[PDB]
Enzyme design. Structure first.
Site, short mmCIF file in Angstrom:
data_model
loop_
_atom_site.label_atom_id
_atom_site.label_comp_id
_atom_site.label_asym_id
_atom_site.label_seq_id
_atom_site.Cartn_x
_atom_site.Cartn_y
_atom_site.Cartn_z
N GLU A 151 28.06 10.69 4.77
CA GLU A 151 27.79 11.39 6.03
C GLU A 151 28.60 10.82 7.18
N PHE B 48 -11.54 -8.39 15.59
CA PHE B 48 -10.35 -8.65 14.80
C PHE B 48 -9.94 -7.42 13.96
N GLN B 49 -8.71 -7.00 14.18
CA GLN B 49 -8.18 -5.88 13.42
C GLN B 49 -9.12 -4.67 13.43
N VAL C 132 15.70 8.49 -3.76
CA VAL C 132 16.33 9.33 -2.75
C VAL C 132 17.69 8.78 -2.39
N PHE D 165 24.83 7.78 0.13
CA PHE D 165 24.60 9.12 0.65
C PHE D 165 24.88 9.16 2.15
N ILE D 166 24.51 8.09 2.86
CA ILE D 166 24.70 7.99 4.31
C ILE D 166 26.12 7.61 4.66
N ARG E 211 24.09 20.59 -1.01
CA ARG E 211 24.71 19.29 -1.25
C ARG E 211 24.19 18.66 -2.54
N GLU F 130 0.80 -1.23 0.00
CA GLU F 130 0.00 0.00 0.00
C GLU F 130 0.81 1.26 0.00
C1 LIG Z 1 18.02 13.54 -0.73
C2 LIG Z 1 17.58 14.96 -1.01
C3 LIG Z 1 18.45 16.00 -0.70
C4 LIG Z 1 18.12 17.33 -0.98
N1 LIG Z 1 19.02 18.38 -0.68
C5 LIG Z 1 18.85 19.56 -1.43
C6 LIG Z 1 19.92 20.44 -1.58
O1 LIG Z 1 21.10 20.21 -1.17
N2 LIG Z 1 19.65 21.61 -2.28
C7 LIG Z 1 18.41 21.89 -2.78
O2 LIG Z 1 18.23 22.94 -3.46
N3 LIG Z 1 17.35 21.06 -2.54
C8 LIG Z 1 17.58 19.89 -1.92
N4 LIG Z 1 16.55 19.01 -1.74
C9 LIG Z 1 15.17 19.48 -1.89
C10 LIG Z 1 14.81 20.33 -0.64
O3 LIG Z 1 14.58 19.46 0.49
C11 LIG Z 1 13.58 21.25 -0.85
O4 LIG Z 1 12.46 20.43 -1.23
C12 LIG Z 1 13.81 22.27 -1.98
O5 LIG Z 1 15.08 22.93 -1.89
C13 LIG Z 1 12.74 23.34 -1.91
O6 LIG Z 1 12.42 23.65 -3.29
P1 LIG Z 1 11.35 24.80 -3.65
O7 LIG Z 1 11.54 25.98 -2.79
O8 LIG Z 1 11.46 24.89 -5.14
O9 LIG Z 1 9.91 24.11 -3.35
P2 LIG Z 1 8.82 24.31 -2.21
O10 LIG Z 1 9.40 24.03 -0.88
O11 LIG Z 1 7.64 23.50 -2.67
O12 LIG Z 1 8.45 25.87 -2.21
C14 LIG Z 1 7.75 26.49 -3.31
C15 LIG Z 1 7.59 27.95 -2.89
O13 LIG Z 1 6.93 28.61 -4.03
C16 LIG Z 1 5.86 29.40 -3.54
N5 LIG Z 1 4.86 29.51 -4.59
C17 LIG Z 1 4.06 28.52 -5.07
N6 LIG Z 1 3.38 28.92 -6.17
C18 LIG Z 1 3.81 30.22 -6.41
C19 LIG Z 1 3.48 31.18 -7.37
N7 LIG Z 1 2.61 30.97 -8.35
N8 LIG Z 1 4.11 32.37 -7.29
C20 LIG Z 1 4.95 32.61 -6.29
N9 LIG Z 1 5.33 31.79 -5.30
C21 LIG Z 1 4.72 30.59 -5.41
C22 LIG Z 1 5.39 28.61 -2.29
O14 LIG Z 1 4.56 29.42 -1.48
C23 LIG Z 1 6.73 28.19 -1.65
O15 LIG Z 1 7.30 29.18 -0.79
C24 LIG Z 1 16.86 17.65 -1.51
C25 LIG Z 1 15.99 16.61 -1.82
C26 LIG Z 1 16.36 15.26 -1.58
C27 LIG Z 1 15.37 14.18 -1.94
C1 LIG Z 2 -5.65 -13.81 9.42
C2 LIG Z 2 -5.96 -14.16 10.87
C3 LIG Z 2 -7.23 -14.62 11.19
C4 LIG Z 2 -7.56 -15.00 12.49
N1 LIG Z 2 -8.85 -15.48 12.80
C5 LIG Z 2 -8.93 -16.29 13.95
C6 LIG Z 2 -9.99 -17.19 14.08
O1 LIG Z 2 -10.86 -17.41 13.17
N2 LIG Z 2 -10.03 -17.90 15.27
C7 LIG Z 2 -9.12 -17.73 16.26
O2 LIG Z 2 -9.16 -18.44 17.30
N3 LIG Z 2 -8.14 -16.78 16.16
C8 LIG Z 2 -8.02 -16.10 15.00
N4 LIG Z 2 -7.01 -15.21 14.84
C9 LIG Z 2 -6.29 -14.72 16.03
C10 LIG Z 2 -7.21 -13.72 16.77
O3 LIG Z 2 -7.25 -12.46 16.06
C11 LIG Z 2 -6.79 -13.46 18.24
O4 LIG Z 2 -5.44 -12.99 18.25
C12 LIG Z 2 -6.83 -14.76 19.08
O5 LIG Z 2 -8.04 -15.51 18.88
C13 LIG Z 2 -6.75 -14.40 20.55
O6 LIG Z 2 -5.93 -15.43 21.15
P1 LIG Z 2 -5.65 -15.44 22.73
O7 LIG Z 2 -6.88 -15.13 23.48
O8 LIG Z 2 -4.93 -16.74 22.92
O9 LIG Z 2 -4.54 -14.28 22.94
P2 LIG Z 2 -4.59 -12.83 23.59
O10 LIG Z 2 -5.57 -11.98 22.88
O11 LIG Z 2 -3.16 -12.38 23.66
O12 LIG Z 2 -5.18 -13.02 25.07
C14 LIG Z 2 -4.43 -13.70 26.11
C15 LIG Z 2 -5.33 -13.62 27.34
O13 LIG Z 2 -4.61 -14.37 28.38
C16 LIG Z 2 -4.63 -13.60 29.58
N5 LIG Z 2 -3.45 -13.97 30.36
C17 LIG Z 2 -2.15 -13.70 30.06
N6 LIG Z 2 -1.30 -14.33 30.90
C18 LIG Z 2 -2.13 -15.07 31.75
C19 LIG Z 2 -1.88 -15.92 32.83
N7 LIG Z 2 -0.66 -16.20 33.27
N8 LIG Z 2 -2.94 -16.47 33.44
C20 LIG Z 2 -4.18 -16.15 33.04
N9 LIG Z 2 -4.55 -15.34 32.04
C21 LIG Z 2 -3.46 -14.82 31.41
C22 LIG Z 2 -4.62 -12.14 29.05
O14 LIG Z 2 -4.97 -11.25 30.08
C23 LIG Z 2 -5.61 -12.22 27.87
O15 LIG Z 2 -6.98 -12.06 28.25
C24 LIG Z 2 -6.63 -14.85 13.52
C25 LIG Z 2 -5.35 -14.39 13.21
C26 LIG Z 2 -5.01 -14.06 11.87
C27 LIG Z 2 -3.61 -13.57 11.59
#
Ligand SMILES: Cc1cc2nc3c(=O)[nH]c(=O)nc-3n(C[C@H](O)[C@H](O)[C@H](O)COP(=O)(O)OP(=O)(O)OC[C@H]3O[C@@H](n4cnc5c(N)ncnc54)[C@H](O)[C@@H]3O)c2cc1C
Ligand SMILES: Cc1cc2nc3c(=O)[nH]c(=O)nc-3n(C[C@H](O)[C@H](O)[C@H](O)COP(=O)(O)OP(=O)(O)OC[C@H]3O[C@@H](n4cnc5c(N)ncnc54)[C@H](O)[C@@H]3O)c2cc1C
Ligand SMILES: Cc1cc2nc3c(=O)[nH]c(=O)nc-3n(C[C@H](O)[C@H](O)[C@H](O)COP(=O)(O)OP(=O)(O)OC[C@H]3O[C@@H](n4cnc5c(N)ncnc54)[C@H](O)[C@@H]3O)c2cc1C
Ligand SMILES: CC1=C(CCOP(=O)(O)OP(=O)(O)O)S/C(=C(\C)O)N1Cc1cnc(C)nc1N
Ligand SMILES: CC1=C(CCOP(=O)(O)OP(=O)(O)O)S/C(=C(\C)O)N1Cc1cnc(C)nc1N
Ligand SMILES: CC1=C(CCOP(=O)(O)OP(=O)(O)O)S/C(=C(\C)O)N1Cc1cnc(C)nc1N
Ligand SMILES: [Mg+2]
Ligand SMILES: [Mg+2]
Ligand SMILES: [Mg+2]
Lengths: 583, 583, 586
Positions: free
Chosen positions: B475, B113-114, B386, B471-472, B256, B51
Site C-alpha cells: 500500500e 480498585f478497578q 490477516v 500487505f501494508i 485485491r 482475553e
Molecule cells: C485482508 C482482507 C482483505 C479482503 N479484501 C477482499 C477482496 O479484495 N475481495 C473480496 O471478495 N473480499 C475481500 N475481503 C472480505 C470482505 O471484506 C468481505 O467480508 C466479503 O467480500 C463479503 O463476503 P460475503 O458477501 O460472502 O459475506 P457477508 O458480508 O457476510 O454477506 C453475506 C450476504 O448473504 C446474505 N444471506 C445470508 N444468508 C442467506 C441466505 N440463506 N440466502 C440468501 N442470502 C443470504 C446476507 O444477508 C448478506 O447480504 C477481505 C478480507 C480480508 C481479511
Molecule cells: C495489583 C494492584 C493492587 C493494588 N492494591 C493496593 C493496595 O493494597 N494498597 C495500596 O496502597 N495501593 C494499591 N494499589 C494502587 C491503588 O489501586 C491506587 O492506585 C493507590 O492506592 C492510590 O495512590 P495515590 O492516592 O497515591 O494516587 P492517586 O489516586 O493518583 O491520587 C493522587 C491524589 O493526589 C492529589 N494531588 C495531586 N497533586 C497534588 C498536589 N500537588 N498537592 C496535593 N494533592 C495533590 C490528587 O488530587 C489525588 O487525590 C494496587 C495496585 C495494583 C496494580
C-alpha cells in the site's frame, strides 16, 4: 504557498515537544505515516508489535515525564487494540493523544472494508473524542486535543479520515498553542485552616501521616515532619519511594499490596493526615472506622471529603502546605507510640531480610528481588507489571527519591511491564531500567520484547515464573467453594521466547544461581536488553490483610498455622510493642 | 430449596448446548469461576493467555458451527481485552455472549480498585448490553442475552457484579428458553419475480453469477447452473470453496484478495446475478459501473438494492431460489463468452502452478502453500490470519465443499489465526486444522500457542515470515510520497517461540526443505500441535487490481515491467481470449 | 450535468413514498430546507411548534400506516428535542428517519456556536446513527438509513453538516433503493407442532387465548376459534379492537390498564395460548405463576420463551398459525369454564354501563367517554395520551376492527395525544380523529394545538381535566407513607388555551352538558379542529389489580369500602360464577 495537512500535524506534535510516538501502520493511517516518514530527524516513530503496547507506552511516557504520550492505531482493529493503554491513561489521569485511522471521507458510511463509525468506540475512555472532517482545521483539532489532554489529565482521541492529511492547506494559517502552555502560580496555603489542622495533628495520641503521589514533591518535608514530631509515615503503594524505604518510621502501604506495620498502625491511629491521597480501598476496607479526626490536604476540590468524613480539608499544594506546617512546629520528644511503631518496623524488616537472605535452595520471589536490589543503580527506574509482583516489589525493593517506579495503578491492566520499560528507556537512555513482571503479565505483551531488541533499548527484564495467576489463585483460596480453576497453567520458558526475538537471556530455578546471572545481566544491559526467567515456588506471600499473630484477636491454632505457612515465627503483633512501651 | 445463582447461570449455558468457553479469571469474576469449577464434566473451560484470544475463539466457534460462542473477561482490563474479538463477531454477524466481571454491588460507584461504570464500554459493539443488579433474575438475563445474540446475529454483553452469583435463589424459579429455539420455515421463492429474473439472466450476452457466503448451502445449484447455462462463476473471497476451486469456470474473487479472471470478467459483464453477497468494495471500486442489469437474491431486506441500483431483487433463500431457477432452465450450447473465460482461467491457473512448482531456491509464499496443499486432508479446516496470507491462500489453496476456512472477514483484525484454529480443533477434534498466518499477525497472539499445547490441540501452524507488514508495505508503495515506514522490522524466530511454549517446530528458508518438513508436521499433528516458520522473500504478489497486460489499455513499457516483476510473461489479458472467440 | 445533493436527498425521500415530514428550521438545516422549498408540490413539510411533536408525529405516522415517519431538528437543541419521540419509535418498534442539522464541515470541531459532536447524542436510541461527511454519498446515506429503519423496525439518525446539501454532485450517479424494498418473509407453521399445540389447548380445563398486536391480521380467526372451541379471549391493551369489544367472550386486558374479567380469568387458567404478544408485566406481576402449559406463537425468535417457559413454541405468522388451528378443530360444547367467564363479562359490562349512563351531576371521565362513543364514526381513529385515559379508554371505548387507536405503548411518553392526532388526520383526512388526553399530557404538547389550526386538521381534542397527575396520585396512595406530593396542581382552562391558538372550544363540568357540546364538536370537526375541556372529578377508577369483592380473600370492611368508592355494589367476583357452574375458586 501550501503545506500538506499531515505535515502540519507533525509540526504541531513537534511544537508541543513530542519526542517519540508509537503505533502500527495501515492503509487507513498511511497519510500520517507519510508525514512521519519525512520527519525522522525530529520525531521518533516506534513501531510496536501490538498496538496495546504503544498505548501503554504512551501512558507510561506521561507517567514518567509529565509530557503527553502519543500513540496511534489503524482503522477498526488497530485502534481497538489501544484500549487497555487508553483506559490505563484515563484511570491514572495522565495525558495521552491517540490518533485513529479512518477510511477517506469519500467512502465513510458506505459500509466498505473495515469502515465503521469509529467515534462511539472511544466515547467512554476519552476526555475529547472527535472525527476530523476537514484538512485545513486538522492541525487545530490536534492542537485542541493536546491542550485538552493536558488540561484535563486524560485521553484525547482523534479519528482521521485518511484523505485529509494528503490535502494541501495554506501554509501560513495553521498554528500550535504550545507557546502559551504554562503551569499555575498558586496562593499560599490557607493560613487559618493550616494552623488549625496542625493543632489537631499535634494534639493526637496516635497520629499518622498517610500520603499518596500528590505528595511527590514533598518527600523532604514528610520525613522532617515525621522526625521532628515523632509521627510515623505511611503511603499508598504508588507513593513508595517518595520517602526512602530505609527511613525507620516508614510503615509502608495498607490493604494487600501492603506492609504489616502500616495496616496495624492505621487500625490504632486516632488522627490521620491524608495528604495527596485517593486510596481506593478507604471505604470498602473500613480503613478509617476507628479514626477520631481525619485531616486532608489535596489540590483537587473533587477529592475534598471524598474518602472519609473530614474534620478539616485544606485545598492546597501538598509541598507548600507541609512546609508551612513544618515552619510552625518544633521538636517533640519520643513518645511510646513512636517507639512502638519503630520496633514494629524493625521486626518486620528483619522478617523480610530473613526471606531475602537465604543462600541456597528452591528459588522464591523474595530472593529474586534481593538480587535485583544488588545490581540496581541508585537512580534506576522500575516498570512493574500487575499481580504478586506489586506486593513483593512493594515489600522488597529498596527505593529512594532518586528512583522511579510505575505500574497500572488503578485500571491495573496486566502487560504493562514491557511497554513501561520501553518508554522509560526511550526517555532516559542513560538510566538503568527494569521490567519486573509475572509470567501471566509478561505473556500478554511478550511479542514486544522484540521492540526492545529492534530499538536497542537495554532493559533488564525479570519474569517471575510460578506457572500461575498467583494473585488470583490466592483470591480463590480465600473465597471459592470449589477447586482452583484457571489459575495454574503450563510453563512458558521466557529464556526461549527471548532467544526467539534475539535477546540474550537466562533461566534460573535455584537461589545459588542468582548472583552470577544477575551480574551477567547487569553487564549485558550496558548495551543490549536482557531477560532473566526466574522459576519460583508457589508459596503464598504473607497476607498483610489477614494477619494472625495477636493472641487477643486470633486463636493459638490460627497463629501457629499462619506462622508456619508464612515463615513468620519471629514476627510479633504490634500490640506486643504497644504494651512494651506502656500503651 | 435453593441454588446458587451462578450454578443456575451455568445450567442456562448447558441448556443452550455450550460445550466450551474461554477466559482468564480474576477476583471480579471468581463467583462465575466457582460455578464453572463444579461443572467440568459438562462444560469445558479453556483458559487462554490473553482475553482477546478468548473473544476471537468464541467468534470463530460461531463462524464454524452456527452455535453461540462464549467468552469472559475480568473487570476493567480483562473485558477491554475482548474488544478485537467482539468487534470481529459484530462485523462478521455471528452470535457471541461475553460475560464481564464487575465489583460487588456493595462497592460499585465507590471509586474502588478497578471499579468503573462498565456499561458504556460495550455500548457500541453490543446488540444487548446490560449490568445485572439482582441474583434471582440473573439466569433470565443470561438466557435473554443468548436468545438475542442468536436472533440478532451479534454480540450480547452482561456485566456481572461478583456478589450476585454467590447468592442463593429459589431452585424452582429459573429456566432456560433453549427448548423454544427453532429455525423458520420459509415460503418458496416468489414465483413471478424469479421467472422474470431468469429471463434477464438468460438474455444476457456476457452473464456472471457472483455469490457470497449467503449461498453457502447452494454450491451444487451454483455449479449446475453454471455448467448448464454456460455462465461463469465468481465469488466473494469468504465464499471460496462453496464451489470447488478446481471447477473450470470458477473465476475467483474481485478487488485485491482476488484472482485475475474475476476482475477482468466483471469489467466486461452485462448482467450480474448477485446472490447472498454483501461485497464491501462494490461502490468504492465502481465494480458495477459497466453492468447493464443487476439482479439480486438475498434473505435480508436491509440488503435489497444496497450495493448497486437493482433491476430485480428477490427476497428469498439462496438455495431455494437457485434451485427454482435450475428447475425452469435447460442446456445452452457453449458460447464465445464461456469459452473466453474458460481459456482465461486456464492461463491464470498455469501461472499460479508455475509459481507453486518451483523445486529449489529462495522460499516464496507460493511454494509454502503448495506444501500445505500436499499434506492437507480433504476436509481440513483453515484458520487464516490477516494480510498477504488472505491474498495468497485465496489463490493457492485447493478447496472443496468439504473444507472450511475462516478469517476476520470485515473487521479484519490481525491475530485471529491462532484463536480460530483453537476453536476449530475444539469443535472438530478429528479434523485436520491449519493456522496460516503472517509474522505480524502471529506475533500479536503468539502467547496462545501455549493454549494449543496446554489443551493438546494438534493444530498445524504455518507462519509466513517476511519481516514485514507486507500487505501494508505494498500500500505504501502505491500511495506514499516518502520512504517506507513501520512496515519492515526485525526477525522473530517462531520455531524458538514454539520451543518456548513447548511445541515442536521447524524453520525453513529454501524450497527444497519443504517436503520433508511438511511430512514431519503432518505426522506430529496426529497427536500434538506443530509450527513451521517459513522464511519467505519480500516479493510482492501480483496485484489483480492493477493488471498491466493489455496493449490497448497499458503502455508496452508498463506491460514489460509488470511481466518482469510478477513472473507473468505467459499471462495473457482477457481481451486476447475474447478476440480469439470472436468478441 | 449536476444536481444539488440536497435536491437528490429529497428525491430519495420521494422515491420511498414519503408524503409529509415534520420539523423546525435553523441555520444548521437551512440547506435541506432550501431543497424542501423547491419540492413543496411533491413532498409536504409540516412545521411544528416543538420538535418533540414532530418526532412523536413521525412515530405515529409509522404506527398508523407502516410507512417510515420522517422528522428533523436543527443542530444541538432542535435535535435533542426529538428524543421523546425517537425513544417512542424505538420502544414501539416503528421505522423513523431523523435528520439532525450540523455546522458545516469547515467549522466542525472548532467549538463554534451550537457546534458539538452530535453523534454520541443519538447512539443509544438509534439503530443507525451516522454523521455524513461527503455530498456525493449523501443520497446513499439517507437511502441506507431508510432501508435499515424499515428492516430493523426502529430509528435511523443522520447528522448532516449544512454545507453538504448545497454542493453539486453528478446528476446520474445517485439512486434510491425504494424500488427493491420488500417486507420480511412470513414464516410458516410446522404442521406437527401446530397439531400438538392444538391437542394441548383442547385438553385444557380452563384455557385462554391471550393475544397482542402481533395478531392484528388474525381477528377473524381469533373470534371464530373462541366461538368454536368455547375458549375466552384476552388481549394486551394495544390489541383492543382487533376483536370487537362487543364480542361476549372478550375479557379485556390484564394488569392495571386492564379489565376485571381478564385479571380474574388469567389467575385461574391452566393453559394459555400466548400469540403475537410481548406483555411486559408477565414476570413482574407473576401473571403465569399457576399456568400449567404455556403455548406461544410469535414471528420473532427473540421472543420465544421470553415471558414464560414454553411447552410448545411456534415461530410463525399469527394468522397463518391460528388459521391452521381453526382448520383442524370442530365445534365444541359449552363448558362450565366458558359459562362462568361469559357471566363475569356481562356483570362487568353492566357495571361500566352504569357509570356511562348517568345523566346528571358532577362530570366523571366515564360519561365523557360515553359522549365520545355517541358521536364516534365506526372507522374513527383515536390518538390516546398517557395516564388514566389509557385505563378509562380501554374500558369504555367501543372499538371494532374498523377502528385504530394508538398511544406510546411501552416508552409511555406523555404528550403523544396531540401529535398522534396530527399524524392521523394527515394520513386519513376523511376519517374522524380524536385526541383523548389528560390535562398533564395535553399540557406538555399544548402549543401544537396551533399546528392543527395552521394545517386545518379537524381533530376532536378531549382534555380530561382533573387538576392531577391522577395515575401517579393513585400510585402514591398505594406505596407512599407520607403525604401526596407533586400530583395535585392548579387548573389550566384548555378552552382558553384553544382560543389562544384560534381553535373553537368548549369547557364542561356537568354530565347534563355533554350531549349538546359533543354534537356541536362533531359538526365543527367536519371542517376545523375543536377542543372540549372536560372538568372531571378526582374519583379513582376501579383498580382491576386490587379487587376487593371476594369474601374468601378480603374482609367485609375492605369489600364495603371498595364497593362504596368505586360504585361497585353490583359487581360479583369471578368465584361467584365459578361456583354457579360447579367449579372451585382455584
Ligand atoms: C485482508 C482482507 C482483505 C479482503 N479484501 C477482499 C477482496 O479484495 N475481495 C473480496 O471478495 N473480499 C475481500 N475481503 C472480505 C470482505 O471484506 C468481505 O467480508 C466479503 O467480500 C463479503 O463476503 P460475503 O458477501 O460472502 O459475506 P457477508 O458480508 O457476510 O454477506 C453475506 C450476504 O448473504 C446474505 N444471506 C445470508 N444468508 C442467506 C441466505 N440463506 N440466502 C440468501 N442470502 C443470504 C446476507 O444477508 C448478506 O447480504 C477481505 C478480507 C480480508 C481479511
Ligand atoms: C495489583 C494492584 C493492587 C493494588 N492494591 C493496593 C493496595 O493494597 N494498597 C495500596 O496502597 N495501593 C494499591 N494499589 C494502587 C491503588 O489501586 C491506587 O492506585 C493507590 O492506592 C492510590 O495512590 P495515590 O492516592 O497515591 O494516587 P492517586 O489516586 O493518583 O491520587 C493522587 C491524589 O493526589 C492529589 N494531588 C495531586 N497533586 C497534588 C498536589 N500537588 N498537592 C496535593 N494533592 C495533590 C490528587 O488530587 C489525588 O487525590 C494496587 C495496585 C495494583 C496494580
Ligand atoms: C400508561 C400505560 C399503561 C399500560 N399498562 C398496561 C397494562 O396494564 N396492561 C396491558 O396489557 N398493557 C399495558 N400497557 C401497554 C404495555 O406497556 C405493552 O405495550 C403491551 O402490553 C404490549 O402489547 P403487545 O404484546 O400487543 O405489543 P408488542 O410489545 O409490540 O408485541 C407484539 C408481539 O407480536 C409479535 N409479532 C409481530 N408480528 C407478528 C406476526 N405477524 N405473527 C406473530 N407474532 C407477531 C412481535 O414479535 C411481538 O412479540 C400500558 C400502556 C400505557 C401507555
Ligand atoms: C489475572 C490477574 C492477575 C494475575 C497476574 O498473574 P501473573 O502470573 O502475571 O502474576 P503472579 O501473581 O502469578 O505473580 S492479577 C489481576 C488483578 C490485580 O486485576 N488479574 C486480573 C486481570 C485480568 N486480565 C488483565 C488483562 N488484567 C488484569 N488485571
Ligand atoms: C498492519 C496490517 C496488516 C499487515 C499484516 O502483516 P503480516 O506480517 O501478518 O502479513 P504479511 O502481509 O506480511 O504477510 S494487514 C492489515 C489490514 C488488512 O487491515 N493491517 C492493519 C491492522 C493493524 N492492526 C490490527 C490489529 N489489525 C489490522 N488489520
Ligand atoms: C407523570 C405521569 C403520569 C400522569 C399523567 O397525568 P395526566 O393529567 O395526563 O393524566 P391523569 O392520570 O390525571 O388522567 S402517567 C405516567 C406514567 C404512566 O409513566 N407518568 C410519568 C411520566 C412523566 N413524564 C413524562 C414525559 N411521561 C411520563 N410517562
Ligand atoms: Mg504468575
Ligand atoms: Mg509479514
Ligand atoms: Mg390529570
Amino acid at each position: 504557498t501550501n503545506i500538506l495537512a499531515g505535515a502540519a500535524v507533525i509540526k504541531v506534535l513537534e511544537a508541543w515537544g513530542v519526542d517519540h510516538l508509537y503505533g502500527i501502520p495501515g492503509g487507513s493511517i498511511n497519510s500520517i505515516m507519510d508525514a512521519l516518514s519525512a520527519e525522522r530527524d525530529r520525531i521518533h516513530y516506534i513501531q510496536v508489535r501490538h498496538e496495546e503496547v504503544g498505548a501503554m507506552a504512551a501512558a507510561a511516557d506521561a507517567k514518567l515525564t509529565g509530557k503527553i504520550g502519543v500513540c496511534f492505531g489503524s482503522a477498526g482493529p488497530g485502534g481497538t487494540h489501544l484500549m487497555n493503554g487508553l483506559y490505563d491513561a484515563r484511570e491514572d489521569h495522565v495525558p495521552v493523544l491517540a490518533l485513529i485511522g479512518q477510511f477517506g471521507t469519500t467512502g465513510m458510511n458506505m459500509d466498505t472494508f473495515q469502515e465503521m463509525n469509529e467515534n462511539p468506540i472511544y466515547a467512554d475512555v476519552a476526555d475529547y473524542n472527535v472525527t476530523a472532517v476537514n484538512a485545513a482545521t486538522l492541525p487545530h483539532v490536534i492542537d485542541e486535543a493536546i491542550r485538552r489532554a493536558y488540561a484535563h489529565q486524560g485521553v484525547a482521541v482523534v479519528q482521521i479520515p485518511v484523505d485529509l492529511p494528503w490535502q494541501q492547506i495554506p501554509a501560513e494559517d495553521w498554528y500550535a498553542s504550545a507557546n502559551s502552555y504554562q503551569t499555575p502560580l498558586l496562593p499560599e496555603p490557607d493560613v487559618q485552616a493550616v494552623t488549625r489542622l496542625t493543632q489537631t495533628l499535634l494534639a493526637a495520641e496516635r497520629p499518622l501521616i498517610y500520603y499518596g503521589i500528590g505528595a511527590r514533591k514533598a518527600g523532604k518535608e514528610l520525613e522532617q515532619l515525621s522526625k521532628t514530631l515523632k509521627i510515623p509515615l505511611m503511603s499508598t503503594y504508588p507513593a513508595k519511594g517518595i520517602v526512602a524505604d530505609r527511613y525507620p518510621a516508614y510503615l509502608g502501604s495498607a490493604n494487600r499490596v501492603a506492609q504489616k506495620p502500616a495496616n496495624e498502625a492505621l487500625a490504632q491511629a486516632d488522627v490521620v493526615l491524608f495528604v495527596g491521597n485517593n486510596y481506593p480501598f478507604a471505604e470498602v476496607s473500613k480503613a478509617f472506622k476507628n479514626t477520631r479526626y481525619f485531616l486532608q490536604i489535596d489540590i483537587d476540590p473533587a477529592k475534598l471529603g471524598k474518602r472519609h468524613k473530614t474534620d478539616i480539608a485544606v485545598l492546597a499544594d501538598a509541598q507548600k502546605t507541609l512546609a508551612a506546617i513544618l515552619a510552625q512546629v518544633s521538636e517533640r520528644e519520643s513518645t511510646p507510640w513512636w517507639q512502638a511503631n519503630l520496633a514494629n518496623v524493625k521486626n518486620w524488616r528483619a522478617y523480610l531480610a530473613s526471606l531475602e537472605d537465604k543462600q541456597e535452595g528452591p528459588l522464591q520471589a523474595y530472593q529474586v528481588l534481593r538480587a535485583v536490589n544488588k545490581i540496581a543503580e541508585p537512580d534506576a527506574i522500575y516498570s512493574i507489571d500487575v499481580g504478586d509482583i506489586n506486593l513483593n516489589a512493594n515489600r522488597h525493593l529498596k527505593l529512594t527519591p532518586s528512583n522511579r517506579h510505575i505500574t497500572s495503578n488503578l485500571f491495573a491492566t496486566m502487560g504493562v511491564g514491557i511497554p513501561g520499560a520501553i518508554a522509560a528507556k526511550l526517555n532516559y537512555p542513560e538510566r538503568q531500567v527494569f521490567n519486573l513482571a509475572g509470567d501471566g503479565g509478561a505473556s500478554m505483551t511478550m511479542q514486544d520484547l522484540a521492540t526492545q531488541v529492534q530499538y536497542h533499548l537495554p532493559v533488564i527484564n525479570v519474569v517471575f515464573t510460578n506457572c500461575q495467576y498467583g494473585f488470583i489463585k490466592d483470591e480463590q483460596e480465600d473465597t471459592n467453594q470449589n477447586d482452583f480453576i484457571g489459575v495454574e497453567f503450563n510453563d512458558i520458558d521466557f529464556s526461549k521466547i527471548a532467544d526467539g526475538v534475539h535477546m540474550q537471556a537466562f533461566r534460573v530455578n535455584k537461589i545459588e544461581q542468582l548472583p552470577d546471572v544477575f551480574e551477567q545481566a547487569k553487564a549485558i544491559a550496558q548495551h543490549e536488553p536482557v531477560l532473566i526467567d526466574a522459576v519460583i515456588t508457589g508459596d503464598r506471600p504473607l497476607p498483610a490483610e489477614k494477619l494472625r499473630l495477636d493472641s487477643a484477636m486470633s486463636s493459638a491454632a490460627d497463629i501457629e498455622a499462619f506462622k508456619q505457612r508464612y515463615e513468620a515465627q519471629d514476627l510479633q503483633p504490634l500490640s506486643t510493642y504497644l504494651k512494651q512501651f506502656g500503651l
